Write a protein that binds this ligand. Sequence first.
Ligand SMILES: [Ca+2]
Ligand SMILES: [Ca+2]
Length: 330
Amino acid sequence: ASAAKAGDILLSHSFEEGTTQGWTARGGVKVDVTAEQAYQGKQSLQTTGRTEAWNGPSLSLTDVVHKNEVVEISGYVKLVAGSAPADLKFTVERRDGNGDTQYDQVNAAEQVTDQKWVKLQGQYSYEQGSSLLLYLESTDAKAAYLLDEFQIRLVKAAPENPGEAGQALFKADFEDGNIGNWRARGTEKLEVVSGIGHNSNRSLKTSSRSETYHGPLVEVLPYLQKGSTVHISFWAMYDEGPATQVINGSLEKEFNRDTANLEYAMFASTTLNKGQWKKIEADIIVPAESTGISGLRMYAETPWKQSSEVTETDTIPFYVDDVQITATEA
Ligand SMILES: [Ca+2]
Ligand SMILES: [Ca+2]
């Protein structure tokens, strides 16, 4: 039940109030606020007395960053006067699932100087861990430096209800409210609705359908091993019209960037009861590289009829949710 949402600020430190705002010494160092220099405002965070590369100012992230969240960590840095140029980076010390120490890289090291403030920035996430310690490090073990306008932003919330270990290659739950790369096939309308979903708040609605082939489509080739065997699954529901309706799950294939000569293949179909969610699934073979395959797109449709024979019941709007592609091998 994640509180924070994408784009939300988790932490912001300007060091303007003469407290280190949670930052402390890692190793035998001196970490304090200074009013001597700053990026913004009057004050910044100073670190001196380093003697080992791993020494630095540190900040506990245990209560800030959660499992599988993607966050963005940033700050401005500058070397203390009289310091030789040196390379700086953010690192996260993490205790893994079995209490072993891991060292996670946040950003790639940047050359920093005593003349000028430099922006450090990177994205971070973790799958398993008990404690998290962010620190600002240099390979120069003697280097002393300032930090200011430090910030942590939430980029992507943790998915919800993350079963069987086949490895999830592709997932769409729509909970972030985002249509992403999903597109219409013709003139129909795609919309991420809230208040309707499969054991969830949101799902992908397709409406204003006027042809049977109209339905939601997404390119999936990039997420997949060419030649592999994978399991495609999604959930569908329709809420109006007849007592029963068939939905199909199909694949649209493109070879050698030839857009004029597509191949189509149905992988599954099921009969749905009005108002009920039902799983549509199958194993499929991703075409081999030798085929010259350049596009592979999954979609949902109602069974094919010619335009002249198309009725109000063929063109029903429907919802799709918990779309998922998993590997068969691990
Ligand atoms: Ca400041
Ligand atoms: Ca959903």
